Amino acid sequence: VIQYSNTGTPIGKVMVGLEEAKDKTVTSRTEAGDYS
Amino acid sequence: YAKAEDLVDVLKGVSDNLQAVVIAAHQGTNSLVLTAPPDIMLALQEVITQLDIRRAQVLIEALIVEMAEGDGVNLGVQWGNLETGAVIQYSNTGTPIGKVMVGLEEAKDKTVTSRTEAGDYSTLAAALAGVNGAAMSLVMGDWTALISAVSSDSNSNILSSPSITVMDNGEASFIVGEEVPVITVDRKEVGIKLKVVPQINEGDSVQLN
Amino acid sequence: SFIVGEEVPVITVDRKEVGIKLKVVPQINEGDSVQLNIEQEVSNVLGANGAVDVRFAKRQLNTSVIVQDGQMLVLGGLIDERALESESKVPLLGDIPILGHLFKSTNTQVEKKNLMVFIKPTIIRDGMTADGITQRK
Amino acid sequence: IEQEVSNVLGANGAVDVRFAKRQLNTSVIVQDGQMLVLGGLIDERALESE
Amino acid sequence: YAKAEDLVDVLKGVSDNLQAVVIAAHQGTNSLVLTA
Amino acid sequence: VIQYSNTGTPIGKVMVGLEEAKDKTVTSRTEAGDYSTLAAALAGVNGAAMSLVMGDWTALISAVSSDSNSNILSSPSITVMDNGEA
Amino acid sequence: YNYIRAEQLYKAEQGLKLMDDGHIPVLPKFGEDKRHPAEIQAFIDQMEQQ
Amino acid sequence: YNYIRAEQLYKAEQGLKLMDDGHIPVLPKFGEDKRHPAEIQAFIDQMEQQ
Amino acid sequence: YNYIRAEQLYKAEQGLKLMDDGHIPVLPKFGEDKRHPAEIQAFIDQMEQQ
């Protein structure tokens, strides 16, 4: 990361959040990830 | 020009002492009622006429200049190989390569034999969470070199000036603030306060407390 | 006294008034020169972010001044200015003039706050004077 | 005179209920039959944000 | 140049002792009133 | 072991951690071991805790030359009237 | 005072990084009291001229 | 007072961003006391004329 | 005082490791009171020259 706390959001939270908000697959079922 | 409620206090000593006399101040009309012998009277009258001058007044303009300037450089490169627990880690930098490599492994998709499972980035997020700069990983055949750099250059230039106007020798407070309450619960004021008892001297030389 | 406000109650439970207060003991002098003993508070119950109870945001200014009849005089004041810059950068890469901004994170903030309290005593002797003051209003 | 319009509002933050009180207690001297203005407040605010 | 509120304290001893006198300090005008 | 407490990490914690961080097999399933024990070991290593693993004798070499430096220079002036406290 | 003012005038040469350089608080020249920001001063005269 | 008034008259030149420029509080000219908003002043005379 | 100053001047020869060597606090020469950082001093004269 080249993250900064000083800005609203830090890229970490955002990239983690984006991965969690992605549809995962547990093998076959599909599941829609939480955008929480 | 004077509050009589307060002048009667001073004339009490001139009054009785001189006689060796009842001075009473009627709030309403800011008129104090003297019941003197005629000399004591002519005397109290000469005392009240010299205490009863107008008061000049000072415009106390304070000028608080808080000018703060901060400059940090963290630069520090951490090598790591978790296959065979080999770190060159540093605590002094944002993140330590251990947390980061562990986090990266947990954020990887595991396999429990056949099911697949997507690992939680909860450990990697706790690592990268606290990186305030640049925590880049040159992954060279399984030796993860996390290079970290940040040149935090802060700067602050506060210039708060509160003036109060006050009558000479009067106390005057000024507080632009907030009353936060605090356990002991008392409610203490916390702001720009300025509490001057400005007392003007001869030679127009104000003497502030 | 004059208070246009709210009595918020606050732990210690006492009920403290928190508003535009103005408590003048105006005392008219010879030469129509009013001499006010004023306690003036604008205050404004905010949250208690951290604190036990609610934090009142109070700007009180209690002084004694001496004003002409009908001219305004300035009791109080505050001219705050602030200016916080911050820049986290990838040290040396955040130097380049054109591309620096890709690696830098700059955060600038400038707060400027002018609080003057003026006070104007007007003396109402003759009824006719009151009619005007009042009527006009 | 002690004149109070007040108007128990909620207690957003506070322990108990916050009374919204506009009291104005003074002493004035009025003609017989003419009105006189005890009190006042002309607030104006204007918050922009962008 | 002096606070009279505090000078009256000192003159109390000069005052009575010398006589063997009421000194009073009027805050307002930073003028102390002597009756000697 | 030839372990030392005086150094960041002691080889025990590190070797245990490394075994726990290895993929176990409970017969056939496979399972990926938690690096929670290895992270608790390596967590506290402030220098360089390198492992030359020589046929099953893990030699954890540790080195750090922590060179700190502090140079605070705070000067407060007050103005005061003689014989007044400030 | 004159030392602070020097510092602050400096920070005006290398101005508030992304803002207009005018917003950075600067002490006035010693014993000159405040001078209005330029834009407002420019406005005020224009009004005066009108 | 006259300094604040300058600032505030300014903020009237660059008015309350989405509102009608008339609502922005402005101190009156020093010792002139209040002047009614224009619309109301316009109304009042019209009434007077009637 | 003169001993500390020596130490600190030293740490200026081997300067704040990654910063510009100018930021490292150094006591002034004994009884000279402060001297402005060079850049600001350079700025101040330039202003004076102007």
Numbering used by the authors:
A (entry chain O): 349 to 375, 390 to 398
B (entry chain A): 248 to 267, 283 to 375, 390 to 460, 475 to 499
C (entry chain O): 449 to 460, 475 to 599
D (entry chain N): 500 to 549
E (entry chain B): 248 to 267, 283 to 298
F (entry chain B): 349 to 375, 390 to 448
G (entry chain B), H (entry chain A), I (entry chain C): 600 to 649
Question: What did the published study say regarding this structure?
Answer:
Pathogenic bacteria commonly employ the Type II Secretion System (T2SS) for the release of protein toxins. The system includes an inner membrane platform of GspC-E-F-L-M, a periplasmic pseudopilus composed of GspG-H-I-J-K and the outer membrane secretion channel GspD, called the secretin. In numerous species the targeting, assembly and stability of the T2SS secretin in the outer membrane require the function of a small lipoprotein that binds to its C-terminal region (the S-domain) and serves to pilot secretin monomers from the inner to the outer membrane via the LOL lipoprotein sorting pathway. In this study we used cryo-electron microscopy to characterize the structure of the secretins from V. vulnificus and A. hydrophila and in addition determined the crystal structure of EpsS from V. vulnificus.
In addition, we also solved the cryo-EM structure of the EpsD secretin of V. vulnificus, which encodes both an EpsAB fusion and a GspSβ/AspS pilotin (EpsS). Analyses of top views of class averages revealed that, for both secretins, symmetry is unambiguously pentadecameric (C15 symmetry). The resolutions of the resulting symmetrized maps were estimated to be in the range of 3.4 Å for EpsD and 3.7 Å for ExeD by employing the gold standard FSC criterion. One of the clearest differences between the two types of secretins lies in the outermost region that is positioned towards the exterior of the cell. In EpsD this region is covered by a ‘cap’, formed by 15 aligned β-hairpins that lie on top of the membrane-embedded region. This region points towards the inside of the pore, closing the structure on the top. V. vulnificus EpsD, however, displays a well folded S-domain (residues 588–649) with a clear α-12. The Ala-Phe motif is present in EpsD, much as in its counterparts from V. cholerae and ETEC. Interestingly, as in the case of GspD, α-12 from the S-domain of EpsD was in a conformation that did not allow for EpsS binding, and our attempts to fit EpsS into this region led to clear clashes.
